[PDB]
Amino acid sequence: LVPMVIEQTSRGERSFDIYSRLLKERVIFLTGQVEDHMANLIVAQMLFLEAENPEKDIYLYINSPGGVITAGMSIYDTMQFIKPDVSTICMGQAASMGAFLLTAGAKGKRFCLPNSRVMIHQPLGGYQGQATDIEIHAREILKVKGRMNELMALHTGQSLEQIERDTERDRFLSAPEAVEYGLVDSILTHR
Amino acid sequence: LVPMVIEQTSRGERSFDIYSRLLKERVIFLTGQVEDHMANLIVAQMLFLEAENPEKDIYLYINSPGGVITAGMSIYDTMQFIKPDVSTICMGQAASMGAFLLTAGAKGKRFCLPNSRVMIHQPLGGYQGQATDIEIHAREILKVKGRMNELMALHTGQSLEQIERDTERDRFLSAPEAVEYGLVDSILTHR
Amino acid sequence: LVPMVIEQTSRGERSFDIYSRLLKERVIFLTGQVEDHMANLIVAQMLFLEAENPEKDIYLYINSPGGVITAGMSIYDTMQFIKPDVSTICMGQAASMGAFLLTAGAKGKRFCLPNSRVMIHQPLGGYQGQATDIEIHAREILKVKGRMNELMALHTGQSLEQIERDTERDRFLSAPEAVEYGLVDSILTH
Amino acid sequence: LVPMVIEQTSRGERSFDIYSRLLKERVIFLTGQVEDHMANLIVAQMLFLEAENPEKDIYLYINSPGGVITAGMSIYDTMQFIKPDVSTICMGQAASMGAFLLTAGAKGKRFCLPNSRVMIHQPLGGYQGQATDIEIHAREILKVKGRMNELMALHTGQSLEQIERDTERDRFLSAPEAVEYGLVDSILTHR
Amino acid sequence: KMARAGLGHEHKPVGSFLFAGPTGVGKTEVTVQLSKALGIELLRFDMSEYMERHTVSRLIGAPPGYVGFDQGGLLTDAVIKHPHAVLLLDEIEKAHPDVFNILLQVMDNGTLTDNNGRKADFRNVVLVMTTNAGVRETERKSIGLIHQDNSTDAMEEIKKIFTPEFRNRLDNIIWFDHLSTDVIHQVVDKFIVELQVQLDQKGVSLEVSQEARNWLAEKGYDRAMGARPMARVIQDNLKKPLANELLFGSLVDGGQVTVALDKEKNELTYGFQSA
Amino acid sequence: FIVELQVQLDQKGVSLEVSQEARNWLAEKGYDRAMGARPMARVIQDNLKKPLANELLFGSLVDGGQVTVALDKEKNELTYGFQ
Amino acid sequence: KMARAGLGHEHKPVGSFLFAGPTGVGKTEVTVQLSKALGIELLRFDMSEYMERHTVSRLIGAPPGYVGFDQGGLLTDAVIKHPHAVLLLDEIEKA
Amino acid sequence: HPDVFNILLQVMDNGTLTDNNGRKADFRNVVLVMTTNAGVRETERKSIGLIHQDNSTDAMEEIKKIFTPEFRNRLDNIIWFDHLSTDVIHQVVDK
Ligand SMILES: Nc1ncnc2c1ncn2[C@@H]1O[C@H](COP(=O)(O)OP(=O)(O)OP(O)(O)=S)[C@@H](O)[C@H]1O
């Protein structure tokens, strides 16, 4: 069960969940596999925080193993649209989609824990049906692959040609190596 | 779980769910495969907003990957008889029902994000039984496909023959392509 | 999950479910396959609204895909029994039982959305057992079939012989076409 | 999901579930197959109403397709034991167990909807095992059938021999026929 | 007009008025002019301070001293001191609901009873109120990917904030239209004219360009705050630069001043001549 | 209520005559089942007293001391004749 | 009538009556239409105001050593000032 | 107590005050200044997150509530004081 935390508000004591209390501090946790329903919650959280105080920056702690690419795009599109800088702090693990969101964070606010491990690979999708349907369905997969390389390369800063070869197969980048690659500005070794 | 959000009022502090607070601002979220159970919730939300303030417009995000033909029409039908304009900002992904609902939004209010993918395919259904029953069922289900093209033609503005050719097989449209085809309009993207 | 929508009252603010808030406005929502538990919920809601204000009419949104025939009859009898007119609104697919509730609605207030479809078919069920047992069950469904056609014909006003011909074979009717049959008084312009 | 309803009181608004609000007016609801757990709730509701107002009558709405005989006996015993006269209204359909409870209603307050269907038949309880065990179990089931037929005969008023003939096989009965048979005093007439 | 005709109950108060919109909607102006036109002393009590048990006691209690018995109710004695004086109330939304209930009592019976035993008659006083609920809701932005106007009807806010009986006893809900840009331009001229007359006594002459008045109008005036910021904006912008020169500089004698703005940098340029 | 209004006007010197049909219309709108006769005082106050007061200060009532109350069937709104 | 005749309660009030009926049916008016006819003072207290526990101290006054000791009870002051009068309590249920 | 604010209000607007003797005091020459400690209140606790977030107190929230609006409006300027910077603190060491 989620623990309950009490906030020492002057008007009266306020009861909150651990996630809700942290959300009041513009902290959002991207935990679990990427999905349409879970992604919707993150979008709703970002919208609420931006309206409450667009001047303050929003934080995103990514500890997800990846998932559906389409669901993740909603988070990516909303991250740039909202005025608050979407800080991305990779924690524990960053898969292809999780890594994509990590780079999406505002420049200068992207961080990785000292022992955090990142993984980047090409989207995996398959379709079954008539030959004509597979060709058109397959074409969209390749088209999407180009789109991810373009957006990832822009934030990372790596050349498009290098991204294709690296993205062809799974690439595990340790936290120091991620800074070299350009995924994160620096590592939060200690306070 | 849904995090709680505190809205400050003159009377005093109040707590609402993240989905509930967004609904208070005439924001409705459509997620997952459309169905009678979920569609009724969206229909219920629209009816409540109309009674609360018919003057103010409503919003409807579309992240569904598909749905049920019958369930989707219920949401579309509601939009027709309610005075508030139902904005349709596609988030992440659209499909046969999502695109129909997305284009259904009032002209000038419909929108789509840059990375959202809008898929439009003809309705597909399977039925078995007596030969006489299949023949009558086949003509009626085919009529629904024709109805979709006629309704789709009105919002898109293209001829029913053009939409039928494009919708004969699964079609994937990029966000710029979708705007050019009349399905949606470009977001302001200004802050 | 369902959103919670607050209400405005002189005493203060009361939180309500989206379904409960609409109920305050004499609006009932019907969805999913008809069931004994589901039918009891609609019946309880109708009885409560009647007591609250008999003069004020009630509204019902039917999106049923069909269900138990016996469960649906409870809603029909309760609907006829209650004094306020029930403004049945077909917002989605309506099966044989769902369509019957639409037709059961008080004449002069029935409505159907322009794109919604209404399917009517004969009641169908399967029973396995001894030759004597199937005949008993066959008579019941045959008797019920006549009752459904007779009651549907009464509300619609169509000839009982003609409706039975259409009911035996699975058929679909569009909202404009339904007006001709008499299932719904008229479509909603807006 | 059950909708909530507010009842006005001098002190202030009171929120109760739809089932509880109707229970306040002495309207009990019986639904689904009879069982020990649901029967426990029904008898609990009857006892509570008796203490609140013994003079006022209790209204049981029977919409069950049949259930275990043992659980039903508890409801039958409680209904007869409590001083308030229970009025059983058959909603939708009444099976062997539902019909037995419906007949148990105090004379002069039993009703059947015009479209309701009442079905009465012998118990279907069975047991398997050693021949000695089946013989003892076989003897017990006859006693329940004899006891059930005798109890039904008392309320309906038919002879014991007549009830046995009607319950030898499934006997579906219409609502108007029930009045002639004597299961219910009279049909409920709509306004 | 009803009171002057006399076709009304004697106990009922002379008039009931209401005001809505942002702070500084001419509540002081119209009330001061109304009081002047009617020749009744203007009495104004601010509900903004009545937010605590001690402060809310002030209406019928004697905050200055418990030993003091002459003052009694400060609001009540004010009516007694001047029978015809108008009572101006502002930001009543803040006050507790219990305090607002006493207002309903006097409105119905047109009389009040102090704790000390004094009786006050409201038959000769007009009661007006000011509400600023609109600014709070409209400034807030909708929680959506695309923003929407959050303006709401003033009458809607009065209904939710106050009890239904208050509106029923109240003769009518009066909503004052919002300020217009033309009035703001005139307001800027009035302040410059006020500053101009003040300088003429010292012997300094100030000339302001028409474009300068418009420039101050856009940044100074605010929709939420009405014309209150424009007043403050005119004081710091004009009094501060000349002040240094008046003590020592070109403006010590002659007092020749010119005010103009530069379109390229969009900043006011001040020209000082010794004269 | 009309008698009270008529008595008040009589002291001022104005005579009021109200049509019998007009009284029936006022009764339905003024009286509410849930609120009983509570709104009847407000309806009579706003509808009748406010217009008459305007003429009393200046108009037909100040010069002639006569007034009449009528109902408009098409508009279902009371009409007052001042003389 | 019995009170004037000498058959009224020696220590209890002249009469205690509770009117339970729909609002606006004249329950309140009977009280104000009897004082004018009898030519006696009318004492009316708004029970709705006395909706909290602290409010009861207002009618009887605060005890010695408190802020409200100086101010006498509202109910006691009114009845002492007007011994012969009609006491009207409205919305007693909300009290 | 707020009673003093009334004396300051009269002193500020009229520019003179009368004591028991009734002599008139000239406040035009004197310059009146006050020091309030409402601004000391600050949110010392840092954000609940890996990265600390700056917190800004609402401008004059406590000052607005504690003082009356008419008195506050009369004040020409409610001067504020910012926290001493690290570089500024070095200068203080020399003093
Ligand atoms: N039988 C009656 N004859 C004449 N007037 C009546 C009668 N019954 C009720 N009224 C009127 O109904 C109005 C309200 O009745 P009350 O019993 O005083 O209720 P109330 O809720 O206290 O009313 P307010 O003070 O107007 S909110 C008054 O105008 C009464 O004179």
| CB atoms closer than 10 angstroms to residue G23 | 14
Look up residue A150 and give its two tokens: 């373009």
Distance separating alpha carbons of residues C170 and D145, to the nearest angstrom: 43
Phi-psi region of H6 (alpha: psi -120 to 50; beta: other; left: phi over 0): alpha
Judge whether B111 and B184 are in contact, CB under 8 Å. yes
Q: What span, in angstroms and rounded, lies between the C-alpha atoms of D28 and D49?
A: 10
Per DSSP bridges, beta strands B13-17 and B4-8 are antiparallel
Using CB atoms, pick whichever of D18, D27, D92 lies closest to residue C73.
Answer: D92
Q: What are phi and psi of E271, to 5 degrees?
A: -110, 125
Q: Is residue B73 exposed (0-12), middle (13-18) or buried (19+ Cβ within 10 Å)?
A: buried
Counting Cα atoms < 13 Å in the Cβ hemisphere of B156 gives 24
Give the separation between CA D117 and CA D134, rounded to whole angstroms.
34
Phi then psi for residue A111, to 5 deg, are -140, 155
Give me the half-sphere count of Cα atoms (radius 13 Å) on the Cβ side of residue A17: 13
The C-alpha R_g of chain E, in whole angstroms, comes to: 24
Strand B111-112 relative to strand B185-186, pairing: parallel
Task: Count CB atoms within 10 A of the CB of residue E39.
Answer: 7
Residue A73, helix vs strand vs coil: helix
Whether C91 and B43 have beta carbons less than 8 Å apart is answered as yes
3-state secondary structure of B183: coil
Backbone φ and ψ for F42, nearest 5 degrees, come out as -70, -40
Residue located via tokens 């925080």? A49
Which of C106, C45, C39 shows the shortest CA–CA distance to C73?
A: C39
Direct distance between the N- and C-terminal alpha carbons of chain G, in angstroms, rounded to an integer: 30
Q: Are A81 and B189 a contacting pair, CB within 8 Å?
A: yes
With H, G, I as helix, E, B as strand and everything else as coil, classify residue A126: coil
Sign of CA dihedral D50, D55, D61, D62: positive
- Distance separating alpha carbons of residues A175 and B56, to the nearest angstrom: 49
Count of beta carbons in the 10 Å neighbourhood of residue E138: 15
Question: Using an 8 Å Cβ cutoff, are B68 and C117 in contact?
Answer: no
**Structure token pair of residue D163:** 């009830």
**Assigned token pair, B17:** 């769910």
Enter the DSSP assignment of F14.
-
Q: Please indicate if any CB of chain E lies within 8 Å of the CB of B25.
A: yes
In this structure, what token pair is assigned to residue B69? 């033909």
Q: Give the SS3 label for residue C79.
A: helix
CA–centroid distance, residue E98 to ligand 1 (Å): 26
Domain boundaries, given as residue ranges, for chain A: 1-191
- Give yes or no for a contact between A50 and A85, defined as CB atoms under 8 angstroms apart: no
CB nearest to E105's CB, from G46, G70, G71: G46
Alpha-carbon gap: D92 to the closest alpha carbon of chain C (Å)? 5
From the CB of residue C31, how many other CB atoms can be counted at a distance below 10 Å? 24
**What CA–CA distance (Å, rounded) separates B158 from B162?**
6
The three-class DSSP label of residue A27 is strand
The two structure tokens encoding residue B143: 């009529």
Question: E85, E42 in Cβ contact below 8 A?
Answer: yes
Q: Which residues of chain C are within 8 Å of residue B74 when distances are taken between CB atoms?
A: 63, 91-92, 113, 116
Q: Do C8 and E160 touch (CB under 8 A)?
A: yes
Gyration radius (Cα) of chain B, Å = 18
Residue C174: other Cβ atoms inside 10 A? 19
CB D17 within 8 A of CB D26: no
Q: Which residue has 């609140």 as its token pair?
A: D52
At B119, which amino acid appears? M
The answer to whether C121 is a known catalytic residue is yes
Give the residue from D169, D166, D168, D170 showing the smallest Cα distance to D181: D166
Separation CA E191–CA F72 (nearest Å): 54
CB–CB of E188/E230 below 8 Å? yes
Residues with Cβ within 8 Å of C184's Cβ and at least 6 positions away in sequence, in order, are C88, C90, C102, C110, C111, C112, C175, C178
Residue among G29, G31, G45, G47 whose CB has most ligand 1 atoms within 8 A, to mutate: G29
Query: In angstroms, rounded to a whole number, what is the distance separating the alpha carbons of residues E87 and E77?
Result: 12
Q: How many CB pairs lie under 8 A apart between chains C and E?
A: 3
CA distances from E50 to A24, A113, E54, E135 (A): 32, 53, 8, 21
Helix (H, G, I), strand (E, B) or coil at A142: helix
Residues facing C86 on adjacent strands? C58
* Any F CB within 8 A of E164 CB: no
Between CA G81 and CA G83 the distance in angstroms is 6
Alpha-carbon dihedral G15, G21, G24, G27, rounded to 10 degrees: -10
DSSP state of E220: H
Residues 6+ apart with CB under 8 A from B131: none
Q: Is H26 on the interface with E (CB under 8 A)?
A: no
Helices (H), A53-92: 69-81
Question: What distance in Å separates the CA atoms of residue C99 and residue B128, rounded to the nearest whole number?
Answer: 22
The CB of F41 under 6 Å from ligand 1? The reply is: yes
Q: How far is E7 from chain F (nearest CA, A)?
A: 6
Positive or negative: CA dihedral A47, A52, A55, A60: negative
Tokens coding E270: 């001040």
Q: Is residue D92 classed exposed, middle or buried when 0-12, 13-18 and 19+ CB atoms within 10 A define those classes? A: buried
F23 lines ligand 1 (CB under 6 A): no
Q: Round to whole Å and give the CA distance between E143 and B27.
A: 8
- List strand residue ranges (DSSP E) for chain A, in order: 4-7, 14-17, 27-31, 58-63, 86-90, 93-94, 110-112, 117-120, 171-174, 186-187
Helical (H) or strand (E) element with C62: strand C58-63
User: In this structure, what is the dihedral angle of CA atoms B118, B123, B124, B126, given to the nearest 10 degrees?
Assistant: 150
H34 contacts H11 by C-beta, under 8 angstroms: no
Closest C-alpha to E5, from F55, F2, F42: F55
Distances (CA, A) of B46 to C116, D153, E34, E54, G86: 17, 55, 48, 47, 56
The verdict on a CB contact (< 8 Å) between E105 and G71 is no
Cα separation, H47 vs A26, in Å, equals 9
- Our answer on whether the CB atom of F38 is closer than 6 Å to any ligand 1 atom is yes
Bridge-based pairing state of the strands D117-120 and D171-174? antiparallel
What are F25-33's contacts with CB under 8 Å, separation 24+?
A: F25/F71, F25/F76, F25/F78, F26/F1, F26/F78, F32/G24, F33/G22
Q: Alpha-carbon distance A14 to A2, whole Å?
A: 16
Helix (H) or strand (E) holding G4: helix G2-5
Task: Compute and round to an integer the Cα radius of gyration of chain G.
Answer: 16
Neighbours of E117 (CB within 10 A): 11
Closest CA to E223 of E121, E159, E166, E150: E150
What tokens were used for B163? 């939409």
Give DSSP secondary structure letters for F44-74: HIIIIIHHHHHHHHSSTTTTT-EEEEEEETT
Whole-number Å distance between alpha carbons of F26 and F24: 5
Test the A interface: residue of H48, H54, H56, H61 with most A CBs within 10 Å: H48
What backbone torsions phi and psi does residue A83 show, to the nearest 5 degrees? -65, -45
Count the neighbouring beta carbons within 10 Å of the beta carbon of residue A112.
28
A101, A106, A122: which is closest to A38 by C-alpha? A101
CA distance E171 to C121: 62
Token representation of residue D73: 């006996």
| Start-to-end Cα distance in chain A | 30
Distance CA E174, CA E159 (A): 13
Contacts of E115 in chain G (CB under 8 A): 71
Residue D124's contacts (CB-CB under 8 Å, 6 or more residues apart) are: none
Q: Locate the chain E residue with the closest alpha carbon to B11.
A: E161
Q: Strand, helix or coil at E216?
A: helix
- CB contact under 8 Å between B61 and E148, yes or no, is no
Other beta carbons within 10 angstroms of residue E202's beta carbon come to 10
Q: What is the largest CA-CA distance in chain A?
A: 67
User: B162-178: b or e for each residue (b if 16 or more CB lie within 10 Å)?
Assistant: ebbebbeebbbbbbeeb
Q: Is A45 helix (H, G, I), strand (E, B) or coil?
A: helix
In 3D space, the residue among B10, H71, G44, D10 whose CA is nearest the CA of residue E100 turns out to be B10
- CB neighbours (10 Å) of residue A72? 28
Question: Å from G71 to nearest chain E CA?
Answer: 7
Q: What share of chain G is helix, strand, coil (3-state, %, to 5)?
A: 40, 15, 45
Given in angstroms, what resolution was this structure solved at?
3.4
Tell me the torsion sign for CA atoms G62, G64, G70, G76: positive
The 3-state secondary structure of chain D, one letter per residue: CCCEEEEECCCCEEEEEHHHHHHHCCEEEEECCCCHHHHHHHHHHHHHHHHHCCCCCEEEEEECCCCCHHHHHHHHHHHHHCCCCEEEEECCEECHHHHHHHHCCCCCCCEECCCCEEEECCCCCCCCCCHHHHHHHHHHHHHHHHHHHHHHHHHHCCCHHHHHHHHCCCEEEEHHHHHHHCCCCEECCCC
Cβ(F1)–Cβ(F44) below 8 Å? yes
Question: Catalytic pick from A121, A137, A155, A174?
Answer: A121
E1, two tokens = 């007009």
E strands, B32-90, are 58-62, 86-90
Look at H3 and E46 and tell me if their CB atoms are within 8 Å: no
Dist. CA D58–CA D79, nearest whole Å: 9
Q: At B4, is the secondary structure helix, strand, or coil?
A: strand
Do F and E count as touching (3 or more CB pairs closer than 8 A)?
A: yes
Q: Which residues on chain B are in Cβ contact (under 8 Å) with A77? A: 91-92, 113-116
Q: Which pairs with CB-CB distance under 8 Å and at least 24 residues apart come from F29-33?
A: F32/G24, F33/G22
Residue E160 in tokens: 């939710």
Task: Please state, in angstroms and as integers, the Cα–Cα distance from residue G76 to each residue in D101, E73, G9, G67, H62, following that order.
Answer: 63, 20, 21, 18, 41
CB neighbourhood size of E130 (10 A) = 24
Q: How far apart are CA E222 and CA A27, in angstroms?
A: 34
Edge-to-edge strand ranges of the sheet holding A93-94: A93-94, A117-120, A171-174
Q: Where are the alpha helices (DSSP H) in C65-187?
A: 69-81, 96-104, 131-156, 160-168, 175-181
Decide: E212 and E260 in contact? Cβ < 8 Å: yes
Q: Which residues pair with B29 in a beta bridge?
A: B61
C-alpha–C-alpha distance, residues B90 and A74, integer Å: 9
Q: With beta carbons less than 8 A apart as the criterion, state whether D111 and D87 touch.
A: yes
Nearest C-alpha neighbor of C47 from the set D188, D55, F8: D188
